[PDB]
Amino acid sequence: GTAAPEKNPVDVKGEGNETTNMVITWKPLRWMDWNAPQVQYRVQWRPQGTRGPWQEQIVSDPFLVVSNTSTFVPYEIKVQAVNSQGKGPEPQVTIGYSGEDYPQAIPELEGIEILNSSAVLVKWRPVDLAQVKGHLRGYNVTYWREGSIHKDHVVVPANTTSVILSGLRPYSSYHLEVQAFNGRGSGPASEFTFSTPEG
Ligand SMILES: *[C@@H]1O[C@H](CO)[C@@H](O[C@@H]2O[C@H](CO)[C@@H](O)[C@H](O)[C@H]2NC(C)=O)[C@H](O)[C@H]1NC(C)=O
Ligand SMILES: *[C@@H]1O[C@H](CO)[C@@H](O)[C@H](O)[C@H]1NC(C)=O
Ligand SMILES: *[C@@H]1O[C@H](CO)[C@@H](O)[C@H](O)[C@H]1NC(C)=O
Ligand SMILES: *[C@@H]1O[C@H](CO)[C@@H](O)[C@H](O)[C@H]1NC(C)=O
Ligand SMILES: *[C@@H]1O[C@H](CO)[C@@H](O)[C@H](O)[C@H]1NC(C)=O
């Protein structure tokens, strides 16, 4: 009656919570697919694209911690179900990542356009993703009035590289910071100044 497992697990994912690890997880197979009273998981992984053979470990838990990784690098991951009668299908491959670090990227100014005495348009260049040290989640635009300390800020998505700042006091000097952020946190701030005209 017993046979090899019917299917391999779904929802394979690799994500670090430290720069030196990657946690591989998956949905345990439903018992009807074990074809056996126990099932284990053959986990294979390697840094993406290396001729070196796959690292491999068999576990019964639906997760595996890969340690001693470089910071935010891609890994190829295969998870095959196995039991005493044999192995599931040849598995599909998922890309996972070791853990994120703070970005090193610092946004560069494209321009600050003065719109009115109460509004400006801030434009920056898209950061280089290789310096994000993680998945780019957005930008944070911090600004405050010096005069002419309450600090305001505007969070935009990762796809967005300008923002209008409204409700500014007229004839005032403002400081402005722009930071990229990933899942770990924000990078260093590029630091700018602008003045609103009279009103
Ligand atoms: C945008 O910048 C603000 C500060 O201008 C950041 O605010 C901090 O958020 C953390 C949560 O991760 C809090 O623990 C701190 O107390 C906050 N500090 C201040 C001074 O507000 C905020 O993290 C940034 N937003 C994003 C999405 O990175
Ligand atoms: C990271 O995830 C692993 C696996 O779940 C866990 O053992 C470890 O405690 C986690 N570390 C932190 C700092 O949350
Ligand atoms: C960390 O990874 C390196 C990768 O080159 C490997 O050679 C070594 O086994 C690991 N070192 C430690 C101290 O865990
Ligand atoms: C200032 O410019 C902003 C941004 O375009 C706009 O929403 C607002 O209506 C303008 N204010 C005035 C008084 O024209
Ligand atoms: C990126 O661009 C468009 C317009 O802002 C938006 O519909 C899309 O959802 C954005 N992405 C995210 C993750 O918000």
Swiss-Prot record:
Comp. bias (Basic and acidic residues): 4-16
Localisation per UniProt entry: Cell membrane; Cell projection, Growth cone; Cell projection, Axon; Cell projection, Dendrite
Domain Fibronectin type-III: 8-101, 105-199
Known function: Neural cell adhesion molecule involved in the dynamics of cell adhesion and in the generation of transmembrane signals at tyrosine kinase receptors. During brain development, critical in multiple processes, including neuronal migration, axonal growth and fasciculation, and synaptogenesis. In the mature brain, plays a role in the dynamics of neuronal structure and function, including synaptic plasticity.
Disease: Hydrocephalus, congenital, X-linked: An X-linked recessive form of congenital hydrocephalus, a disease characterized by in utero onset of enlarged ventricles due to accumulation of ventricular cerebrospinal fluid. HYCX is the most common inherited form and occurs in approximately 1/30000 male births. The primary diagnostic criteria of intellectual disability and enlarged cerebral ventricles are often accompanied by spastic paraparesis and adducted thumbs and, occasionally, visual defects or seizures.
Family, per entry: Belongs to the immunoglobulin superfamily. L1/neurofascin/NgCAM family.
Subunit architecture: Interacts with SHTN1; the interaction occurs in axonal growth cones. Interacts with isoform 2 of BSG.
Official protein name in the record: Neural cell adhesion molecule L1
The encoding gene: L1CAM
